[PDB]
Amino acid sequence: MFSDFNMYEAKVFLKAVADAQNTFRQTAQQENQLARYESQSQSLLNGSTSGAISITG
Amino acid sequence: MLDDTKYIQMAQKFPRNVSVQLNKKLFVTRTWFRNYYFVGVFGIFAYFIYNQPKIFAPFSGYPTTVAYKAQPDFLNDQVIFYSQQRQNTLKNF
Ligand SMILES: CCCCCCCCCCCCCCCCCC(=O)OC[C@H](COP(=O)(O)OCCN)OC(=O)CCCCCCCCCCCCCCCCC
């Protein structure tokens, strides 16, 4: 259809676009994962201190 | 027609109690020469045929692979891993 040169141009550009979308995903996931870990740790601390649960072993 | 008279006679009339003892050492020597020329000569060809496809076509021999994802564990300085089974497939042609 198109010369091989244009096909490889398209391949490179598509690789870059996929990498950009992965960059968006990585940024959002890292931020929310840090927030999640903080929230879960705080929840476990509050639970143990409040006497709601006992965490042993 | 070939004049097979004497061979026909030999076939018809052969002794049925004559046997010869065989020197075990010489029999073993010849057989182990045969083994030497099988393992060390034809073995090369056989191993090439058996293995070369496994070198130039490796993806068909390992069907399933594993992938990992990791998360930190700050309060314990650990790393938590989640595994996943995948079909081992080509990638980045
Ligand atoms: C996990 C557990 C595994 C266990 C594995 C166990 C393996 C056991 C193997 C036993 C091998 C016994 C070999 C015995 C050879 C005897 C030879 C013999 O009787 O003839 C002697 C003859 C002497 O030669 P000549 O020049 O006439 O000199 C006169 C000397 N009086 O000699 C000759 O003329 C030359 C003789 C050549 C002998 C060639 C031997 C080739 C052996 C190939 C073995 C391949 C095994 C592959 C295993 C794969 C495993 C993944």
Automatic annotation (TrEMBL), chain A:
It comes from the Eukaryota. The chain holds residues 1 to 57 of 114 of the full protein. This is Uncharacterized protein.
Automatic annotation (TrEMBL), chain B:
It comes from the Eukaryota. The lineage of its organism: Eukaryota, Sar, Alveolata, Ciliophora, Intramacronucleata. Keywords: Membrane, Transmembrane, Transmembrane helix. The chain crosses the membrane at residues 32-50. It comes from Tetrahymena thermophila (strain SB210). This is Transmembrane protein, putative.
